[PDB]
Design a binder for these strands. Structure first.
Ligand SMILES: [Mg+2]
Ligand SMILES: [Mg+2]
Ligand SMILES: [Zn+2]
Length: 462
RNA sequence: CAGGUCUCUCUC
RNA sequence: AGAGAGACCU
């Protein structure tokens, strides 16, 4: 992706979109009980922790575009992947505006406690001033679709979250692009069924992990991915995507049977317009991180990508022996023979992709189930039942979370949730964690899940 | 102060 | 069916 032009909102006739500059995050009662190196992201340019220019850091993920049109390696990949999806028989018919707004069995409803985005966000209109979960009225939507139409600008906001202090130093906070509700709807009307299939079938057929549950899915992955493991993260995946991939996406959608006017919407997220404060900018390429289908389209593009890279990098590759699951830019894959990921990253560079070890190690080492990760979690065979696999969120990640809060009101829920992550690291670590929670007044007040109840409840999922 | 997922908690 | 929250990915 690459920013094409930037114009004053005076010149574009775009309403200013301004967001909060102070974080909700406050140290918690547990801040000094546990060790941690994270602090809230830089939200304002006059942040004293800054060592570089904020806004230039913010937008530096737009590294540019390489390809615009697929090459032969990428065409082949797109058609291999689309053939794989054919067996899912996706309903390419348009989803009803009702089901699009209020969801189905395999698709959540539009998030009503979230901004309606441009222009509503500046017109003081919330999503609930238009949508209503009880009525399931759609008519108020239709009037509004007609009024403002589609292809409405994305509202750029900086993301409130804990980041490493290196990334605070360098001001590399995360950008998200608030989608206008109109676009959200129309995309869900076009692809809601595809969403449904993908959510219902995490695994190696969709090649997506969206809609998986790590407590049960982790035991299937060593079976889903047999052979030699390999894995990736990207630095700045979303913005690094050149339009080629979006073209390649189009081919996939055409092949599985989308109409041409359905497939047309892909250029509307390839080529986007964004308002950040008092300016308007154009982005060519780059996934609007924050549109409908973000995680799915990322995951779909990833599947195209891996294949394209394999067959451009290595002789004798047979993509039928490829197993990969992807969650956005997260990849866990396997092949009958060890894959040299340093060479795939080389090829990645030529497509404008910056690829890294999934651990953000400084080099690519052998990947096996004892060091593999996915969605931050590791893989730990249960000591009693070795065929059942624990998802292991690192204690130091859990430690980072617990040290802050956006609202101490939820301390109970927050701590309980972390506990449900932490017990997979086994009895010893969990009581070490619990003891530490207990060593502060507020911890002794909290309802903390018993280890053996957790384990028994995990066992009975099977 | 976005798009999604999973899970938990509280209700009716 | 409604209200919280935490975590994950962009
Ligand atoms: Mg990344
Ligand atoms: Mg990642
Ligand atoms: Zn443009």
């Amino acid at each position: 992706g690459e920013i094409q032009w930037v114009k004053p909102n005076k010149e574009t006739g775009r309403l200013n979109i301004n967001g909060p500059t102070r974080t909700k995050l406050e140290p918690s009662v547990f801040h000094d009980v546990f060790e941690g190196n994270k602090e809230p992201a830089v939200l304002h340019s006059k942040d004293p922790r800054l060592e570089v220019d904020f806004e230039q850091a913010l937008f530096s993920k737009y590294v540019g575009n390489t390809l615009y049109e697929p090459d032969e390696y990428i065409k082949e990949a797109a058609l291999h992947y689309a053939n794989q999806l054919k067996q899912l028989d996706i309903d390419t018919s348009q989803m009803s505006m009702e089901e699009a707004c209020y969801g189905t069995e395999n698709l959540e409803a539009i998030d009503l406690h979230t901004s309606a985005g441009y222009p509503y966000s500046a017109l003081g209109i919330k999503k609930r001033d238009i949508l209503d979960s009880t009525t399931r009225d759609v008519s108020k939507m239709k009037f509004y679709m007609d009024k403002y139409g589609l292809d409405l600008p994305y509202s750029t906001y900086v993301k409130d979250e804990l980041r490493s202090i290196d990334k605070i130093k360098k001001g590399k906070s995360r950008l998200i692009e608030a989608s206008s509700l109109n676009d959200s709807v129309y995309l869900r009307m076009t692809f809601g069924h595809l969403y449904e299939t993908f959510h219902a079938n995490p695994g190696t057929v969709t090649g997506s992990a969206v809609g998986c549950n790590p407590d049960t899915f982790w035991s299937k992955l060593p079976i889903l991915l047999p052979g030699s493991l390999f894995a990736f993260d990207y630095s700045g995946y979303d913005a690094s995507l050149s339009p080629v991939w979006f073209r390649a996406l189009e081919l996939v959608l055409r092949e599985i049977g989308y109409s041409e006017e359905a497939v047309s919407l892909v250029e509307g997220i390839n080529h986007t317009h964004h308002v950040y404060r008092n300016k308007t900018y154009c982005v060519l390429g780059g996934m609007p991180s924050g549109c409908s289908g973000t995680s799915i389209f990322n995951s779909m593009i990833n599947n195209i990508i891996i294949r394209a890279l394999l067959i451009k990098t290595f002789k004798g590759i047979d993509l039928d022996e490829l197993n990969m699951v992807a969650y956005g830019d997260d990849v866990l894959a396997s092949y009958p023979f060890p894959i040299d990921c340093l060479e795939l990253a080389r090829t990645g560079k030529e497509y404008g992709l910056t690829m890294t070890p999934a651990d953000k190690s400084p080099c690519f080492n052998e990947v096996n189930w004892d060091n593999a990760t996915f969605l931050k979690r590791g893989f730990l065979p249960d000591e009693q039942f070795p065929f059942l696999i624990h998802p292991t969120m690192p204690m130091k990640e859990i430690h980072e979370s617990i040290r802050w809060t956006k609202d101490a009101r939820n301390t109970q829920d927050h701590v309980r949730s972390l506990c449900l992550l932490a017990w997979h690291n086994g009895k010893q670590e969990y009581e070490k964690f619990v003891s530490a929670i207990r060593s502060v007044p507020v911890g002794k007040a909290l309802a903390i899940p018993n280890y053996e109840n957790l384990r028994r409840n995990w066992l009975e999922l099977f």
